[PDB]
């Protein structure tokens, strides 16, 4: 039933709102300057990065600059993996999958979801950090010494094009769900049940886009290509990651990320 597909769409959106603290809706309001909330602290150079040390709060307690920024992205990614795991568990059928298949879906899925959702926090000028407490300029991130100055440009470039599609949180909830339920991730044991779930999610997405974006017939086909594109973004990221792990004297990589990156491309 189409009605059931709308109910599924709504369930995913409600779960999405529960699982992810900063939504695109709120992020756009902040970025444009509509919210009654206090303005994000702007980090545009080294000096303002230092000043931001006091103002911006991080959930994790931690009693050179390029490295600290990279480690900061690391920890945000750790938080994001946990948020995304919570969301995946709300997708009907997911928790009933073989547990090792659940692990596999997350392992290969999370970074693609991280960068999808990171777009919501980005414009052409910079990215929101720490739930909107801070805004780091795209230019400052680019100015970082190599290899780090190029760490995030691929993502800003993806985000600028992706945001031009003008999806909202209701679109994104289903888009994310489809990506997570990918039946072609390496090493999946029981493919059919994942394919069947994704097939229904894809039907939900198609109907969502037809109703929510009536004038843009091409949107569904474009989003399917963005899913393929996201795999390339993650590939590039993993490769720059190996460059960093070497071209720098070894730094600490979070064990959750180590686990994900093992056998990741």
């Amino acid at each position: 039933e189409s009605a059931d597909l709308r109910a599924l769409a709504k369930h995913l959106y409600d779960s999405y709102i529960k699982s992810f603290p900063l939504t695109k809706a709120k992020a756009r309001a902040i970025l444009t300057g509509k919210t009654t909330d206090k303005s994000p602290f702007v980090i545009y150079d080294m000096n303002s990065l230092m000043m931001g040390e006091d103002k911006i709060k991080f959930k994790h307690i931690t009693p050179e600059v390029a490295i600290r920024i990279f480690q900061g992205c690391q920890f945000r990614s750790v938080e994001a993996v946990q948020e995304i795991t919570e969301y995946a568990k709300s997708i009907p059928g997911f928790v009933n999958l073989d547990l090792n298949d659940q692990v596999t879906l997350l392992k290969y899925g999370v970074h693609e979801i991280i960068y999808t959702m990171l777009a919501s926090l980005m414009n052409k000028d910079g990215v929101l950090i720490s739930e909107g407490q801070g805004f780091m300029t795209r230019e400052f991130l680019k100015s970082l010494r190599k290899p780090f100055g190029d760490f995030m440009e691929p993502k800003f470039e993806f985000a600028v094009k992706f945001n031009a599609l003008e999806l909202d949180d209701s679109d994104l909830a289903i888009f994310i769900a489809v990506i997570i339920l990918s039946g072609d991730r390496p090493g999946l044991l029981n493919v059919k049940p994942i394919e069947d779930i994704q097939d229904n999610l894809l039907q939900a997405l198609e109907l969502q886009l037809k109703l929510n974006h009536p004038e843009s017939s091409q949107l569904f086909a474009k989003l399917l290509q963005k899913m393929t594109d996201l795999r390339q973004i993650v590939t590039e990221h993993v490769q720059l990651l190996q460059v960093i792990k070497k071209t720098e004297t070894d730094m600490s990589l979070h064990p959750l990320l180590q686990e994900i990156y093992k056998d990741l491309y």
Binding site: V81, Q82, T85, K89, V95, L99, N100, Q102, V103, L106, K107, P255, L256, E259, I260
Partner: peptide, 10 residues
């Protein structure tokens, strides 16, 4: 694995 633990937690 750590991912498995996150998945199992209610």
């Amino acid at each position: 694995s750590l991912l498995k633990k996150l998945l199992l937690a209610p």
